[PDB]
From a paper:
Leucine-rich repeat-containing G protein-coupled receptor 4 ([name]) plays a critical role in regulating the wingless-related integration site (Wnt) signaling pathway and is essential for organ development and carcinogenesis. [name], along with its ligand R-spondin (RSPO), potentiates Wnt/β-catenin signaling by recruiting its signaling suppressor, E3 ligase Zinc and Ring Finger 3 ([name]), and inducing its membrane clearance. Cell surface-expressed [name]/5, members of the class A G-protein coupled receptors (GPCR) family, have an extracellular domain (ECD) comprising 17 leucine-rich repeats (LRRs), followed by a seven-transmembrane domain (TMD), and an intracellular domain (ICD). [name]/RNF43, [name], and RSPO form a ternary complex on the cell surface, which relieves [name]/RNF43-mediated suppression of Wnt/β-catenin signaling and thereby potentiates pathway activation.
We purified LMNG/CHS detergent-solubilized ternary complexes of human [name], [name], and [name] (residues 56-267, ECD-TMD) from Expi293F cells cotransfected with [name], [name], and [name]. Cryo-EM analysis of this sample revealed two distinct [name]–[name]–[name] complexes with stoichiometric ratios of 1:1:2 and 2:2:2, corresponding to a heterotetramer and a heterohexamer, respectively. We obtained cryo-EM maps of [name]-[name]-ZNRF31:1:2 heterotetramer and [name]-[name]-ZNRF32:2:2 heterohexamer to resolutions of 3.2 Å and 3.5 Å, respectively. In the [name]-[name]-ZNRF32:2:2 complex, another copy of the [name]*-[name]* complex was bound to the other protomers of the [name] dimer, [name]* (the asterisk indicates the second protomer in the dimer), forming another set of 1:1:1 complexes, thus completing the C2-symmetrical 2:2:2 complex. In the [name]-[name]-ZNRF32:2:2 complex, the TM helices of [name] protomers were visible in the cryo-EM density. The two TM helices of [name] were loosely sandwiched between the two TMDs of [name], especially between TM1 and TM7 of one [name] promoter and TM6 of the other [name]* promoter. The two TM helices of [name] made contact with each other at a distance of 5–7 Å on the extracellular side of the membrane. In addition to the ECD dimerization of [name], these intermolecular contacts in the membrane restrict the spatial positioning of the TM helices of [name] and bring the intracellular region of [name] into proximity, which may facilitate the auto-ubiquitination of ZNRF320,28,29. In the 2:2:2 heterohexamer configuration, [name] ECD and TMD are largely enclosed by [name] and [name], resulting in steric hindrance that prevents [name] from binding to the FZDs, thereby suppressing its ubiquitination activity. Moreover, no apparent contact was observed between the two [name] protomers within the 2:2:2 heterohexamer.
Numbering used by the authors:
A (entry chain D): 283 to 473, 520 to 564
B (entry chain D): 706 to 822
C (entry chain E), E (entry chain C): 57 to 246
D (entry chain B): 40 to 143
Write the structure that this text describes.
């Protein structure tokens, strides 16, 4: 039951190979980790941190896995420098905007996650410099326009909860995509695995199934109209 | 709830329409006679019968999900609703046009009005 | 949804060719795993061999169709992990599919098939009864075997005749109503 | 792609020269042809009129063999006797370590 | 009949967990092999490495998805074996499935799909073009990879409700025939 941790309570440990902190609610600042330059993994959940020091990628050069979920992170500083970083998870935070240069040069990034945030504006070139990113997660957010440049290598993706996302995506940019979960099934009509499926209730290209059925309803409509109008003429 | 209500009024309607047609049949005076009113009487009789002749299956397919005992593909209810919901309407004018001498008299009147127009 | 499992016993001829003898099995694709087709060698695992968080002692190669035999639920009153947790841990370890013998812990069937909004990309199959005892008998007797998980495609669409014959009674009955009124009309004529 | 009548990038060489040995090299999944003037250790050059190919030295305990069963030199711990590998020099023969082979 | 192929790579984490990155492919289940689903590691083989009748040099383990790249048909004017012979030999070696790159020898497609009354229990897939060059590029680059082959189930039965419209025209036209005669009858009445 860790409640509070001293601000400068982890510096100078020049060989601290890992650091995990959970439940430290009373913490309100990022720890003063200067000097500790051998953190392969890092975790800080359930804490009131607002921002991040900018020299983070310049200090923990060989940082590999990072997680900052369940925090009050609002503004994302530049992540250029953590050239060995693989997973980032910032879910359940107050992140509201994404700039172009935030993910500049994350060569080895594999897993990304920003779900349950307030992000609505993604710069077009946000993912241009990305490497072999496989899972991207921006579910439960306020996205309206989704850039896709430099994303063809993705394998799994989710957008569920993005109600403002009323548009679709071009399959030309999702060559290797396997699993997808979009808020509206119509966004999946363009394409392998999808959620929710485009069932017969909501077709893709023809509202009336196949041909000769459209002809059926055509004939029904013409005969109904003509006979009805003649009936009105005769009656009234 | 709305589907149950619409069915409830549908069954009550079908019952009372059947009862009324039975009452019309029981009327010997209008039955044995060749009165012109009986023409449209039978006309609305066939219309009222075919209304659920074509809508009762739609009700069956709407309650099919409620029964949730048979694996029904979406396409089957889709097709039956798209074909059998507008069906009871689009054929009634044809039936009145081609199965009622009263309409023929009305059409003669329409021809007279067109010629005098 | 049923799973068709074949266990292949290959024997190395000295010349280099392989002779195979296969045995059939049938399970049920559990909801926790996507209903797909997998293939890999059988690696039986103890139930308690999955909770441990030090995998470095048992780094297995990829594509191993793990097999677990669940035991008396009261025998483990303090469950280290849920069944879905075991499946997730196995898939993390490089398993391509997971098979559970629930012959002794039948509640595991509903535990797997219950509402879990985190389905696994690899199939999960639970067997029980004669198939389960057969699988246990082969596993604890042979040396190397390769299991294959087959998902039979669906069956014929009997929906064809359904609505045309349905419309057949509809048309027949509608005409029957029409002729019954015509019969009344003929009665008036007489 | 040296000494190759027809070299493809994916499959390496596919038809060695007239007087050359066509040998298949295994590396990871990649398998590709090669042309050598003499087959490497553990293989014996088998000539042919169409294409000359190397084959594995089937005789056990062998590192270089002249034919399918005649080993020019066995591994350590096995003296050479008529091209065959024996740990001990049999009767009528005594070990000779200087050349590591069975002498009278 | 189309075959969907996933090429999965690994990165063994020191902790013991496995990380994967998959790539898609599409081929055609050739008639020579039964359309099924198979899985196994990729073992590329030279075309000339199959006809040899001494496997003892290179005995492989069971369940390996072999890959072959066929070449210019004139480059082998004296064909060591037919393509079906190559597939049979590969299956003898313990291959669980075989994939051919026919990008350079297109006639192999009809050679495989032609009348051969000896189908193989394991699927045979031929690819060509962009997918073929992608597969060759990955094979000669990576170190370990596992290929998964999937047989997509058939699509929806539109056969369901095509008769409903077919009988609809039929009933409507028959009504048209009857009603036209009634129109003639009304003309006689006038």
């Amino acid at each position: 039951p860790l409640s509070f941790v001293g601000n400068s309570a982890f510096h100078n440990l020049s060989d601290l190979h890992s650091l995990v902190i959970r439940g430290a609610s009373m913490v309100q600042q990022f720890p003063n980790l200067t000097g500790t330059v051998h953190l392969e993994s890092l975790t800080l959940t359930g804490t009131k941190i607002s921002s991040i020091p900018n020299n983070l990628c310049q200090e923990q050069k060989m940082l590999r896995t990072l997680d900052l979920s369940y925090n009050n992170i609002r503004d994302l500083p530049s992540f250029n420098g953590c050239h060995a970083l693989e997973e980032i998870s910032l879910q359940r935070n107050q992140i509201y905007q994404i700039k172009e240069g935030t993910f500049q040069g994350l060569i080895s990034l594999r897993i990304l996650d920003l779900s349950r945030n307030l992000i609505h504006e993604i710069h077009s070139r946000a993912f241009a410099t990305l490497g072999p990113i496989t899972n991207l997660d921006v579910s439960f957010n306020e996205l309206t326009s989704f850039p896709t440049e430099g994303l063809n290598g993705l394998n799994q993706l989710k957008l569920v909860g993005n109600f403002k996302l009323k548009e679709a995506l071009a399959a030309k940019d999702f060559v290797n995509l396997r699993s997808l979960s979009v808020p509206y099934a119509y966004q999946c009509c363009a394409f392998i695995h999808c959620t929710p499926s485009t069932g017969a209730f909501k077709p893709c290209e023809y509202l009336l199934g196949s041909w000769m059925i459209r002809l059926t309803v055509w004939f029904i409509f013409l005969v109904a109209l003509f006979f009805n109008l003649l009936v009105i003429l005769t009656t009234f | 709830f709305t589907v149950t209500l619409v069915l409830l009024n549908s069954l009550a309607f079908l019952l009372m329409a059947v009862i009324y047609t039975k009452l019309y049949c029981n009327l010997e005076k209008e039955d044995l006679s060749e009165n012109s009113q009986s023409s449209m009487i039978k006309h609305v009789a066939w219309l009222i019968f075919t209304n659920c002749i074509f809508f009762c299956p739609v009700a069956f397919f709407s309650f099919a999900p409620l029964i949730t005992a048979i694996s029904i593909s979406p396409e089957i209810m889709k097709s039956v609703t798209l074909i059998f919901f507008p069906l009871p309407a689009c054929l009634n004018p044809v039936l009145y046009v081609f199965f009622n001498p009263k309409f023929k008299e009305d059409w003669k009147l329409l021809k007279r009005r067109v010629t005098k127009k | 949804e049923t799973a068709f499992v074949e266990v292949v016993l290959f024997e190395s001829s000295p010349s280099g060719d392989y002779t195979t003898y296969t045995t059939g099995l049938t399970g049920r694709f559990s909801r926790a795993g996507a209903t797909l087709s997998a293939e890999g060698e059988i690696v039986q695992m103890h139930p308690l061999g999955l909770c441990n968080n030090n995998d470095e002692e048992d780094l297995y190669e990829y594509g191993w169709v793990g097999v677990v035999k669940l035991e008396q639920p009261e025998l483990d009153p303090k469950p280290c992990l849920t069944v879905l947790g075991k499946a997730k841990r196995a898939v993390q370890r490089g398993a391509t599919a997971v098979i559970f013998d629930v012959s002794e812990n039948p509640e595991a069937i509903d535990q797997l098939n219950q509402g879990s909004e985190d389905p696994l990309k690899r199939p999960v199959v639970y067997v029980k009864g004669a198939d389960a005892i057969k699988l246990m008998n082969i596993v604890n007797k042979q040396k190397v075997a390769r299991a294959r998980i087959q998902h039979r495609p669906p069956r014929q669409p009997t929906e064809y005749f359904d609505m045309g014959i349905f419309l057949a009674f509809f048309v027949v009955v509608s005409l029957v109503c029409l002729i019954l009124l015509v019969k009344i009309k003929l009665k008036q004529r007489r | 792609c040296k000494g190759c009548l027809s070299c493809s990038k994916d499959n390496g060489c596919s038809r060695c020269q007239q007087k050359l040995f066509f040998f298949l090299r295994r590396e990871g999944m990649r398998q590709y042809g090669e042309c050598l003037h003499s087959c490497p250790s553990g293989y014996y050059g088998h000539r042919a009129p169409d294409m000359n190919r190397c084959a594995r030295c089937r005789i056990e305990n062998c590192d270089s063999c002249f034919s399918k069963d005649f080993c020019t030199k066995c591994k350590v711990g096995f003296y050479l006797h008529r091209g065959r590998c024996f740990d001990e020099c049999p009767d009528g023969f005594a070990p000779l370590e200087e050349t590591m082979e069975c002498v009278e």
